Amino acid sequence: PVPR
Amino acid sequence: PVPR
Amino acid sequence: SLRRGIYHIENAGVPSAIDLKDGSSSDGTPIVGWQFTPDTINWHQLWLAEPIPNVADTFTLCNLFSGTYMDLYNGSSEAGTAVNGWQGTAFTTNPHQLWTIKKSSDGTSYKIQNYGSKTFVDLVNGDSSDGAKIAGWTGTWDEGNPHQKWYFNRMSVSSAEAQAAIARNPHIHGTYRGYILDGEYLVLPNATFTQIWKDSGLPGSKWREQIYDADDFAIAMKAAVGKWGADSWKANGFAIFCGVMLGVNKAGDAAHAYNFTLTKDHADIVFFEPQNGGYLNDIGYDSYMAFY
Amino acid sequence: SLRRGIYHIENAGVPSAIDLKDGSSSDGTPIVGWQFTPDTINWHQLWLAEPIPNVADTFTLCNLFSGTYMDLYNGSSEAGTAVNGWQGTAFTTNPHQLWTIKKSSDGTSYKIQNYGSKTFVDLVNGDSSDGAKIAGWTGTWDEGNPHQKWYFNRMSVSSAEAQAAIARNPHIHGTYRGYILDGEYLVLPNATFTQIWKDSGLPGSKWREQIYDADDFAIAMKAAVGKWGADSWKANGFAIFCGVMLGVNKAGDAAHAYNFTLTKDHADIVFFEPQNGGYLNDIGYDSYMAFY
Ligand SMILES: C[C@@H]1O[C@@H](O[C@@H]2[C@@H](O[C@H]3O[C@H](CO)[C@H](O)[C@H](O)[C@H]3O)[C@@H](O)[C@@H](CO)O[C@@H]2O)[C@@H](O)[C@H](O)[C@@H]1O
Ligand SMILES: C[C@@H]1O[C@@H](O[C@@H]2[C@@H](O[C@H]3O[C@H](CO)[C@H](O)[C@H](O)[C@H]3O)[C@@H](O)[C@@H](CO)O[C@@H]2O)[C@@H](O)[C@H](O)[C@@H]1O
Ligand SMILES: C[C@@H]1O[C@@H](O[C@@H]2[C@@H](O[C@H]3O[C@H](CO)[C@H](O)[C@H](O)[C@H]3O)[C@@H](O)[C@@H](CO)O[C@H]2O)[C@@H](O)[C@H](O)[C@@H]1O
Ligand SMILES: C[C@@H]1O[C@@H](O[C@@H]2[C@@H](O[C@H]3O[C@H](CO)[C@H](O)[C@H](O)[C@H]3O)[C@@H](O)[C@@H](CO)O[C@H]2O)[C@@H](O)[C@H](O)[C@@H]1O
Ligand SMILES: [Ca+2]
Ligand SMILES: [Ca+2]
Ligand SMILES: [Ca+2]
Ligand SMILES: [Ca+2]
Ligand code: NA
Ligand code: NA
Ligand code: NA
Ligand code: NA
Numbered sequence: 401p402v403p404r
Numbered sequence: 405p406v407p408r
Numbered sequence: 409s410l411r412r413g414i415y416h417i418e419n420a421g422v423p424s425a426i427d428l429k430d431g432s433s434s435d436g437t438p439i440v441g442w443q444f445t446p447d448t449i450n451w452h453q454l455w456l457a458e459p460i461p462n463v464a465d466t467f468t469l470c471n472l473f474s475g476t477y478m479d480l481y482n483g484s485s486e487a488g489t490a491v492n493g494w495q496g497t498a499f500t501t502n503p504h505q506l507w508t509i510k511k512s513s514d515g516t517s518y519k520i521q522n523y524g525s526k527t528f529v530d531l532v533n534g535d536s537s538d539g540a541k542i543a544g545w546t547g548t549w550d551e552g553n554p555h556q557k558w559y560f561n562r563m564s565v566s567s568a569e570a571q572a573a574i575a576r577n578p579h580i581h582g583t584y585r586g587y588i589l590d591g592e593y594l595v596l597p598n599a600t601f602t603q604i605w606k607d608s609g610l611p612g613s614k615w616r617e618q619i620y621d622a623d624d625f626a627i628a629m630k631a632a633v634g635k636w637g638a639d640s641w642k643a644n645g646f647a648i649f650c651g652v653m654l655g656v657n658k659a660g661d662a663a664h665a666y667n668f669t670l671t672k673d674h675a676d677i678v679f680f681e682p683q684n685g686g687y688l689n690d691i692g693y694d695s696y697m698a699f700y
Numbered sequence: 701s702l703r704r705g706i707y708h709i710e711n712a713g714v715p716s717a718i719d720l721k722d723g724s725s726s727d728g729t730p731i732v733g734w735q736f737t738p739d740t741i742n743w744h745q746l747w748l749a750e751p752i753p754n755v756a757d758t759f760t761l762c763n764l765f766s767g768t769y770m771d772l773y774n775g776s777s778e779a780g781t782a783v784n785g786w787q788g789t790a791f792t793t794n795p796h797q798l799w800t801i802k803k804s805s806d807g808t809s810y811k812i813q814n815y816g817s818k819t820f821v822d823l824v825n826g827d828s829s830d831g832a833k834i835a836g837w838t839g840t841w842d843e844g845n846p847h848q849k850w851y852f853n854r855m856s857v858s859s860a861e862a863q864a865a866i867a868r869n870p871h872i873h874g875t876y877r878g879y880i881l882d883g884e885y886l887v888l889p890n891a892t893f894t895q896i897w898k899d900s901g902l903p904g905s906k907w908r909e910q911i912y913d914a915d916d917f918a919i920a921m922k923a924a925v926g927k928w929g930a931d932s933w934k935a936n937g938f939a940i941f942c943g944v945m946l947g948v949n950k951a952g953d954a955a956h957a958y959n960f961t962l963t964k965d966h967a968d969i970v971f972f973e974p975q976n977g978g979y980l981n982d983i984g985y986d987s988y989m990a991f992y
Contacts, residue, residue, distance in 0.1 A: 402567070403589055403915045403946050403957040406859070407623045407654050407665040407881055585877060587946060587989050589915035589957070613930075618939045620930040623881035631923035638905075638912040647910045654879060665881070697879050699991075 409465055410509045410518065414472060414564035414594055414646060415455050416444070420517040421554030422536035425453040426529075428493045429539065431473040433642065437493040439478060441531050441540035447597045447672065454563060454594075456643050457509070458498040466508045466523050468498055472594075475642030477505040478529075480544045485525040488532070489544040498645060509560070513550050517557040521549075528556040564592050564646060565674050570700060573670055573677050574651075581656055581694040589699060593649035594637075595670045598678075598687060601633075601650070605685050608632035615683060622665035625682040626652045629667050651677070651700035655693025664693045668700075701757055702801045702810065706764060706856035706886055706938060707747050708736070712809040713846030714828035717745040718821075720785045721831065723765040725934065729785040731770060733823050733832035739889045739964065746855060746886075748935050749801070750790040758800045758815050760790055764886075767934030769797040770821075772836045777817040780824070781836040790937060801852070805842050809849040813841075820848040856884050856938060857966050862992060865962055865969050866943075873948055873986040881991060885941035886929075887962045890970075890979060893925075893942070897977050900924035907975060914957035917974040918944045921959050943969070943992035947985025956985045960992075 417426040424441030431452040444450045454472035469478040471493055479494030483504045496505045503524025512519050520529035522544055530545035534555050547556045565573070567588045574586060596604075605611065610628055615621060633650035651668040667680040669687075679691040709718040716733030723744040736742045746764035761770040763785055771786030775796045788797045795816025804811050812821035814836055822837035826847050839848045857865070859880045866878060888896075897903065902920055907913060925942035943960040959972040961979075971983040 401948070401953060401955045402591060403955040404909075404913050405656070405661060405663045406883060407663040408617075408621050590910045590913070592910065616930060617936040618882045618884065619933060619936055620926065621882070624926040624930065627919065627926060628923050631920050634912065634916040634919060638908060638916065641911060644909040644911055697991075699989075 410457060410467065410560060411566070412459055413457060413562055413566070413592055415457055416450060416453055416561040416563055417455055418444070418559040418561055419531045419534075419554070420512070420514070420557035420559060421531070421534045424531060424536055424540060425450060426455065426542065426558070427453050428471045428474055428476070431471070432493065433474040433476050435476070435492070435494050436481070436490075437474070437476070439491045439493060439542050441535065441542060442538050447599065449597070449600050456646060458645065460499060460506060463506070463523070465510050466506055468496065468500060468505055469507055470498065470643045472641050472643045475644070478507065479504045480522045480525055480527070483522070483524040484544065485527050487527070487543070487545045489525070489527065491529060491542045491544060510549065512557045513552060514557065517559050519547070519549060519556055520558055529558065530555045562674070564594050565649065565670060567591055567593075569674060570649065570670065573675060574695075574698060576675075577677050579655075579690060579694050581696040583696050585697055587697075587699040590647035592646045594646055595649050595674060598669070601669050601680065602685060604633050604636045605629060605682065610682055611685060622683070623654075626665040626667050629680070629682040649700065651698050653679070653695040654697040655691065655695045657693055664691070666691055666693070668698070702749060702759065702852060703858070704751055705749060705854055705858070705884055707749055708742060708745055708853040708855055709747055710736070710851040710853055711823045711826075711846070712804070712806070712849035712851060713823070713826045716823060716828055716832060717742060718747065718834065718850070719745050720763045720766055720768070723763070724785065725766040725768050727768070727784070727786050728773070728782075729766070729768070731783045731785060731834050733827065733834060734830050739891065741889070741892050748938060750937065752791060752798060755798070755815070757802050758798055760788065760792060760797055761799055762790065762935045764933050764935045767936070770799065771796045772814045772817055772819070775814070775816040776836065777819050779819070779835070779837045781817070781819065783821060783834045783836060802841065804849045805844060806849065809851050811839070811841060811848055812850055821850065822847045854966070856886050857941065857962060859883055859885075861966060862941065862962065865967060866987075866990060868967075869969050871947075871982060871986050873988040875988050877989055879989075879991040882939035884938045886938055887941050887966060890961070893961050893972065894977060896925050896928045897921060897974065902974055903977060914975070915946075918957040918959050921972070921974040941992065943990050945971070945987040946989040947983065947987045949985055956983070958983055958985070960990070
């Protein structure tokens with residue numbers, strides 16, 4: 401996934 | 405090398 | 409299908425864009441036709457289209473500046489019904505703020521239909537004046553009427569589109585790795601990218617061995633564009649495009665840190681030297697790492 | 701051999717450090733003994749030791765704050781000769797500013813010999829007073845005299861030492877890649893790391909989807925520590941330690957961005973949450989990328  |  | 413993203417929505421008949429008047433966040437702020445300058449940030453004229461799950465071709469349209477939503481006043485199906493900015497949320501069930509957006513009969517422009525009323529966004533009388541009324545109006549999906557046709561000029565890239573632009577660049581090292589940080593990016597004109605650099609204080613910064621060298625300039629420029637994004641816009645669910653790259657020279661015995669942005673057509677990257685504000689197609693290094 | 705790096709140089713007899721008085725950059729500013737507070741930045745008491753090529757165990761000693769060099773006044777071999785701050789360069793041939801630094805007879809402390817005079821740095825009379833004279837003085841390499849013995853308390857890590865600290869951490873993903881930016885890093889006490897965070901404006905910043913989310917906080921904190929380094933210190937040839945990490949949770953279905961710093965003993969990393977100023981040994985993510 402993508403950093404949040 | 406290392407960024408400069 | 410219209411893709412998630414940020415759009416400058418331009419009438420097909422006259423060069424007027426959909427404008428939230430004075431960018432006001434007040435409920436019931438008129439949405440009007442207004443002239444625009446290409447290759448700028450048109451501050452009151454950018455719309456984030458968020459697709460609704462389980463409703464085909466239907467979106468909320470959030471004004472990037474105000475954070476308020478395109479709203480058909482009381483959801484009336486009467487011709488001449490006000491279209492305004494109104495407080496809402498990205499995935500609302502309020503049919504006043506839900507818009508079905510599909511290609512017109514010319515296959516290039518779109519029509520914008522209110523999901524509740526089934527009336528269309530209409531630049532009344534095709535009036536090109538600054539502040540011209542935009543209203544919900546009777547219409548059909550197939551008719552040629554340019555009052556109700558809208559070019560969705562795409563101002564953002566996906567992370568997939570940004571990755572493709574990097575991958576087709578001729579200055580990428582064999583060992584390159586990219587690290588994606590967000591999903592959907594507003595692409596800046598160079599004029600705006602430059603203004604953020606000028607206002608950062610970086611133009612006055614001196615190179616110093618290790619303590620403020622290339623990696624400090626490149627990271628400072630990314631931080632400045634991040635700060636500008638949050639401070640400038642009230643909408644959420646997008647980022648501003650500004651990359652950091654590390655690169656190595658042909659001889660493999662010197663490395664450098666710099667930034668990159670995207671061309672107008674969103675197809676290619678352009679390198680940015682944060683030590684002098686220069687844009688380059690070749691910065692004399694091949695990228696072995698990027699984060700953006 | 702003493703390694704390149706930043707040192708807090710503490711007398712072996714009394715708890716006085718080598719201090720450039722008032723941190724002044726004026727030529728002929730006295731270098732004196734002065735008391736110190738452990739686990740702080742001792743602003744006037746940090747020295748960058750630069751090894752001279754082709755001269756064994758011989759260095760310049762540059763005050764981190766002033767950017768001026770430890771200088772034996774007119775290179776005199778007379779006992780009681782002033783040791784001062786003086787303008788110079790990292791690889792000078794001026795023997796006033798060249799120091800041979802080797803382990804004393806106790807094998808833990810060092811002696812500091814002027815390369816030209818062959819006299820030693822001496823805390824005159826072992827005086828523990830704030831502002832006590834330090835002078836060049838007759839001596840030998842082997843004698844026990846604590847006036848001329850100095851503990852070189854290492855305040856910096858190499859990039860190799862920082863890489864080793866990351867590699868022995870139990871929260872590193874199998875796919876981890878690290879990207880080193882500089883060579884030699886000043887390690888901050890958490891008290892100072894926290895103060896830079898507090899002064900950054902990040903404590904007041906709100907999380908916002910994509911437009912100011914974890915990656916924006918982590919990059920803003922690295923930029924703030926970079927800016928603080930350049931603005932705080934006049935010496936060159938080092939950086940401040942502050943890392944950015946991207947991490948993925950156990951389930952592999954959520955990622956996060958955060959910072960890291962090093963323990964006092966320089967052996968291990970500690971995670972820093974720039975959204976709340978917390979230090980953690982486990983931040984609930986395994987790092988798959990770092991740059992520092
Ligand atoms: C010039 C004019 O264009 C068309 O009329 C438009 C209006 O068109 C729309 O509303 C009408 C009913 O008023 C009808 O439902 C039509 O199908 C629909 O597209 C409307 O766009 C208004 C407001 O801007 O302007 C014009 O009145 C056309 O139907 C007319 O015959 C005439 O050619
Ligand atoms: C207490 C005192 O310690 C030693 O004397 C030191 C001085 O020592 C150094 O200089 C002397 C000559 O003055 C000599 O060359 C000696 O080898 C060298 O280490 C010096 O450190 C001064 C200034 O701080 O203080 C003392 O005078 C020792 O030699 C004395 O006998 C006596 O024990
Ligand atoms: C923020 C503000 O932006 C500009 O004024 C807007 C105006 O902007 C558009 O129209 C002007 C001409 O009036 C230009 O074509 C711009 O390129 C367009 O983006 C409109 O959005 C109106 C109505 O909402 O609001 C104004 O504030 C600019 O002229 C101002 O100096 C200022 O930068
Ligand atoms: C920058 C300045 O730092 C401190 O004063 C220094 C002083 O610092 C040392 O001595 C003090 C006690 O006088 C404490 O032990 C500190 O922990 C030491 O680092 C000396 O360096 C003298 C002589 O050069 O200069 C002073 O400015 C601090 O007390 C000040 O408030 C200020 O932060
Ligand atoms: Ca993100
Ligand atoms: Ca650096
Ligand atoms: Ca560097
Ligand atoms: Ca972000
Ligand atoms: Na109104
Ligand atoms: Na949908
Ligand atoms: Na003097
Ligand atoms: Na040497």
